[PDB]
A paper describes a structure:
Among these channels, the Stelar K+ outward rectifier channel (SKOR) functions as a K+ efflux channel for long-distance distribution of K+ from roots to the upper parts of the plant. Interestingly, SKOR contains an intracellular ankyrin repeat (ANK) domain, which is absent in all the depolarization-activated K+ channels with known structure. Each protomer can be arbitrarily divided into four layers along the central axis: a transmembrane domain (TMD) comprising six transmembrane α-helices designated as S1–S6, a gating ring formed by the C-linker, a cytoplasmic domain homologous with the cyclic nucleotide-binding domain (CNBD), and an ANK domain. Unlike the canonical potassium channel, SKOR does not adopt a C4 but a C2 symmetry, which occurs in the C-linker, CNBD and ANK domain.
Author numbering:
A (entry chain D): 208 to 414
B (entry chain A), C (entry chain C): 208 to 451, 460 to 523, 529 to 621
D (entry chain B): 74 to 453, 458 to 621
Write the structure that this text describes.
Amino acid sequence: DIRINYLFTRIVKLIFVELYCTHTAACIFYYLATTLPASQEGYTWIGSLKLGDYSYSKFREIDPWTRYTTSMYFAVVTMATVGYGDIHAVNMREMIFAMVYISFNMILGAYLIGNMTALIVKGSKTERFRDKMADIMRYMNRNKLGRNIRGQITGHLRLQYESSYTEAAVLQDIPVSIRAKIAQTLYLPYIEKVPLFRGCSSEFINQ
Amino acid sequence: DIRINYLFTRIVKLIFVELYCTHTAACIFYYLATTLPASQEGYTWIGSLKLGDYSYSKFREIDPWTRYTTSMYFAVVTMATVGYGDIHAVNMREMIFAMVYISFNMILGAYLIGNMTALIVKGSKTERFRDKMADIMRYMNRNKLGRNIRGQITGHLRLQYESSYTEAAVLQDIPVSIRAKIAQTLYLPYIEKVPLFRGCSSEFINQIVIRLHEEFFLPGEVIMEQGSVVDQLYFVCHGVLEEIEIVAVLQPDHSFGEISILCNIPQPYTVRVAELCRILRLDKQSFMNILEIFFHDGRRILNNLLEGRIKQLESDITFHISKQEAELALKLNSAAFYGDLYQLKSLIRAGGDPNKTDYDGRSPLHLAASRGYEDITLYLIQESVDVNIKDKLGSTPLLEA
Amino acid sequence: DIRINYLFTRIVKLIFVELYCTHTAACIFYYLATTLPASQEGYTWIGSLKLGDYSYSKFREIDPWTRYTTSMYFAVVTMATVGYGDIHAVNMREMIFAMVYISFNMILGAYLIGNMTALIVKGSKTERFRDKMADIMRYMNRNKLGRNIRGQITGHLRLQYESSYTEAAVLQDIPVSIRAKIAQTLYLPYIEKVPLFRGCSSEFINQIVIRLHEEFFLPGEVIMEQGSVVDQLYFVCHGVLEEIEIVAVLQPDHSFGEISILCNIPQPYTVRVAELCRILRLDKQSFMNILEIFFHDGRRILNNLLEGRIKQLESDITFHISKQEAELALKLNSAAFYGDLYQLKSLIRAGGDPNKTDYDGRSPLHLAASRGYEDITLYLIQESVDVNIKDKLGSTPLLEA
Amino acid sequence: IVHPDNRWYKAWTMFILIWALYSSFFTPLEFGFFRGLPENLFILDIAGQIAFLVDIVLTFFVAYRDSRTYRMIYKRSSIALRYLKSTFIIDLLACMPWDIIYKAAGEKEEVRYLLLIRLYRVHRVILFFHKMEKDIRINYLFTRIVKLIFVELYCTHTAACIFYYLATTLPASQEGYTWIGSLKLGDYSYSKFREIDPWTRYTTSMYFAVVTMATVGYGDIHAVNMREMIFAMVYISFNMILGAYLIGNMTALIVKGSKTERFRDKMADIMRYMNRNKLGRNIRGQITGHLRLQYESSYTEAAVLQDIPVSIRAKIAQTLYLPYIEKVPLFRGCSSEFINQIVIRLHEEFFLPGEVIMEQGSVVDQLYFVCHGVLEEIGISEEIVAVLQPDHSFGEISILCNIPQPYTVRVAELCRILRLDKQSFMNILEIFFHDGRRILNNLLEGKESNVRIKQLESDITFHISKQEAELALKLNSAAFYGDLYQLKSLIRAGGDPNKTDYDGRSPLHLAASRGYEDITLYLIQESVDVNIKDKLGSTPLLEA
């Protein structure tokens, strides 16, 4: 769709795919802790947790809210490759899942950087103006030619950038029927006033 | 290899490299722990490890499985630069290996990002459409076009993208002959069903298929205007086209616009699009060029043109085909009258028989001999033009000299 | 802005953005610690913090300095994804902010890499030299060139890179007039000192400066061969050149290669490079066109050519200038004899006076009238060519017809 | 004297790179892990500064090359002013002995901070990487990788020596607040933090610097003090700029692409188009195989042989193209200097099999020479009327008679074709009138097997007669001005003294016109017609 910003759409899609993967990993990390019976919950990544003075010893019937947001906090930190270390895998089954999840984020993390780099490298229509003038300036500085001649050429580039609207026009992948009508609406008023075309027929000036 | 994918063939290589390096580092790191004697195992990275209630108080004879997955877990975490810190180097020899292993991953890690970035730099099909649309929008909005014409331009550009009408950007690499078979694969069935080309030779038809172009039109558009000279030949391959109060409906497998191409008669009707239609177009210049080479093919098409309102048109075109033959001799004699040697060369190899005369009767030799153009006279000798041809006066080309 | 750098103007913006975000996050994170009452400060990220022997047992009234740098330290470590883990969220509300703050840095962190990458994509001066050298090396090695000629090609490309001889890639944007003043800034002092151009008009000299090109030559190279027709005019402005046993030494502020540019005499000497030399060259097409327009300027140069071995050459050029004047009439009359309309138009507007005759004496009107070319006679009357001119026979153009 | 680029000077420059490399790495160790200097290392400190002192007094006697005219200034005054305003101020401060000054003025730690000004001479090593990067014998990818490693190894080394220095600022009584005095990795104490050994105390600092530089952050070693927190934030912020720079260089090399990547990308787009229409089964093999040869048959395409002086391009062309020109049948009996002019402007092109060079009915503007492969001519069902072999030149018949191309030519096998423009072809013909008539003369003699020449025989016969008439005018003009030197050249190269121009004149008539006896007897010895007659009825003797 052309009514929606293209940069906005790409950013939101990357956020959603990153949010959904993190949400799924958080719900699976907590599931692995419940596989072990309550007798040996001390081996789990959460039953042995102690952040400040909070216990986390029971690990169950705490509440569905604080038990979920601590799992999501574990998934977000490892997904961004921060790795505080307060929450980490302790079991052998959790180590296997962590290695698979971490390896998955390297592919996904490089994909996120690739999209962001692609948009910037594509262009800005202003760095090209700076790059073109920078190369010319080095040539002028190398020869150390003139003082007021610099203003003549630097000012010249200002108008060249401004006076570029129909250059490299993409009005080529258009059917001849459509191009015929638009031409008669813009170019035609500038043709009948030419002194060379006095008394010319309508179909001749149309061709 | 072409059978396998390309992005798949390079994503797996990156995974394999990072998988093999972690496997090697995990095995080497565990070897450094066994270098120290068992008496002082508390100085190692694993002899002093304690995750939960597990103590690793022996670091040996545990099992080859849990003692390997904990070493692999330490290597994978370090490679991705997560660094939980539960497992870390404790010894001087382990610090040196960690410094070397970590420094190696920076070069490898940047290599992974570079390969992934280069795969995304190549723009997608919809990525170029948005860039193209903005450029068209900028130009057409600057000139302040009417809102009525804005929709047709924007609506048609969308249709080209979805239908992939162009689909011929990277096509010049085809060495004509390869492209020739492709063109007749998709366009020949529609051409052969055209009543206009009934009885045409098979070799002649294949010559024009390669030069066709495909495009689509939305309903409500107008292809040709009333009383406008048409320089494009179109063939209907899909949809319904209505010609303007309706008069005739352009059924599929039909052709139109040929009247203005040959007879120079301005188009007497307007074609209005009723539904989505697939149209094949041919440029004016090539069609005239091909007809010049195949004179015999044109005769068959001309005869079937009358067979293909209709009765009145058939009588009218008979008048036009007669005068165009005479018109060739008018400019042929004028070129010889003025002595323009180069101009005459165009009307001999791609025109008519110079031996024929105009309405009054004047062979080009008659004018050349009387006007004393000696140089051009040798050319008529090479063409074996009749020397004793007599006009409606009783004179001969020799007598004029 | 052009006064300030562009690399500097964009690196600072990236630093400022990451500096302001960390400052905001540090202040907001400390606010969440003060939300809880002082009775249960052990549940905060800082009330329970203990780094070394420092305990943070009060978390208040310590000082506004050490209590801010520890919050800023936690924010900067998190932003760079280092994550030591000494300071981390402990509360449910602090986890939510950490999740939001960390997720924000992923987009911002990738943005920093994108700007830095786009700055390095633009290749350096030496980056393109290596790419160019490989392409030249691959081509010349495929044809198996001799080792003697390998050094000259490779050595010369190095000289162009260091000296920046081309330095004119982005130069067509100059609107001629701006470029005109640039050319005379660096090339005029060497041209005015040329003995051959002594006495030339100032306006004429400025016309050829814009069309010059600059190049450098290594010692031991050969610019022109013995007995070879040359088509480039060179002006010495640096170094020493030797002309071939030595004969003469090309001192600076001299010019060579002009013998064949006008008299068509093949070059009788070979120029050998002795030391590094800067040479300005001019192409044949530009030199011929300017001379044709400025007929008066050419006369001054021709007169001073003799003044600028030398005595023998001065007598020889007098023989050649005489025949070229007569040679104009030979082809001038031949075109009129054959009645070539377009050929005759070339030698009148940019040639000589049609009224002059050849060695025997034959005005183009004499041949045209005798040969009976009626159309061409309408052109000679335009230039007011004399019609009573008599050759060395006693006849007139009227009598010939 | 002046030493611009002497081989001995180039040895001195490489000699001082060793000192620059040594003093760049040893300075952080001297600042952080040392208080003063032991007598063992006193010799190296003195010897190092004297070596750089020589360089300061020697760079005033070294010429520098001009940045505008490339003129090698060689001037005493210009050399000194350039060096004084660029680096002399900072290069002299480093050479000053900051160790003996520190010990002589009691024991001031503030004056020892100036010892870090010697970290500037690492710029010598950076210039070395740039110097060898321009060399073509060394791999370009290898140079870039090594430079990135060195620029990161040096930064990590300096940070490790400053992290340990911050721990020694606090007195030994309160060492527990430092990042290292409170360390405990396994069962190791690290409590004393001093007199442990210089080796394990350094490698634990380097291990701290490497882990934080790569953004791993284990957390076993971290800042504990307020002064160490400030340094950590500055160092961490510095690595973000440097870390993104490292990724940028690696991405730039990969984004530049490879030849196989371009081949794969081009074929991938075509394959999607073919699969979209689901056209053909064996058609894919025809086109996929076609791209295989196109990738291989691309060696001189987009050649960079343009930024080369005309003198160099002249010799290389004569060493490759020339052995393929004199063998052309069209150039039989041509002079050496005429065949030299054409070979300068020749262009080389490669055509894949199946391509079409020229189409029937098109205007011809390029002259083509065949050197490799075979060519096929088509005209009319398609009929093959002629097959072109190597050493043959095609396109000359339609370039002299000004006719359109009558037989389109396709490519049947991989061919190497030399191309020359029509505009410059006529210019060489006009200059070389003597050799210009032989090209069409040899062409005319080929009217035995070819049929296109037979129908064009009349036009060719006109041109050879028209050109011959120009010879008579030039030959007659030679005798008018009494220049026998040019007359000899005009007659040996096929010139006929018994040549009559349009107006009845003869060279004998012009010989007697000015009473030149020397030119006269030459014509008689050449069997000239003394009684030759003109329409004016003027005998040569009567005109005399």
